[PDB]
Structure 1
């Protein structure tokens, strides 16, 4: 396992309460040995004015999963913040929930790089994102 912190899904989902993660109903659904996965609804809270998933909402999902995964790969009072993030919106979404899957590209002593792919309910890729974190 890449993780250094041991956390439960329930405890992970409690982290979002009362901040942006909870307000968008981002739910962590699986902690793998080297992956982290969360879903997010496509509705009035996450759509742009023309009925599509907001490109920024996909990025909120990516930065949420990658930063939390980043945090879980540190120990003690180390913190992890997003330093640079980028994304390509390859397909639009309109309804249902999208699913983000995050895996590590680099786990360094001072920086990390995460890949997050976001899929719709038919399993089609909608967003491909890379997040670089700084360990403080």
Structure 2
């Protein structure tokens, strides 16, 4: 178990209300001992002009999940902030919801590296991303 904070999915989902996370219907759905998972619809708010998932929406999902996960691995007054992000778009998505799964690559005292894989509804990899955070 990597977490230092014990926060439920309901509290996480409550925080998204009234901001970008809520606007895109990103929903946190599972917390493992070393994973965090959220889904996002492929719809008008997340689509390119001709119906495929906007690659930027996948990054919004990746950065949201990676930041939350990083924060959960700090304690007390500590905050995390994303410094760098990269993403590889390997497959497109068109319908249903995509699902982001975030795992740690490195949990440091000063920075973290997170990997987020985004899968379509059939479980195929669509986007693979790395987020580097600073702990402040």
TM-score if structure 1 supplies the norm length?
0.98
| CA shift digits 1:107-131 (9 cap, x unpaired) | 0011100000000000000000000
Three-state SS of the structure 1 residue aligned to 2:82 is: strand
- 1:50 shift after superposition: 2.1
Tell me what 2:12 maps to: 12
Gaps of 5+ in 1: none
Three-state SS of the structure 1 residue aligned to 2:10 is: helix
- 1:121 and 1:19 map into 2 onto residues whose CA distance is 25
- 1:51 shift after superposition: 1.3
Gaps of 5+ in 2: none
- 1:44 shift after superposition: 0.3
Tell me what 2:36 maps to: 36
- 1:50 and 1:110 map into 2 onto residues whose CA distance is 42
Give RMSD over aligned pairs: 0.6
- 1:96 shift after superposition: 0.5
- 1:90 shift after superposition: 0.3
| CA shift digits 1:81-136 (9 cap, x unpaired) | 11000000000001100000000000001110000000000000000000000111
- 2:42 and 2:134 map into 1 onto residues whose CA distance is 30
Aligned length: 136
2:130 corresponds to 1:130: yes
- 1:107 and 1:34 map into 2 onto residues whose CA distance is 11
Which aligned segments of 4 or more residues in structure 1 are displaced greater than 3 angstroms? none
Tell me what 1:3 maps to: 3
- 1:37 shift after superposition: 0.3
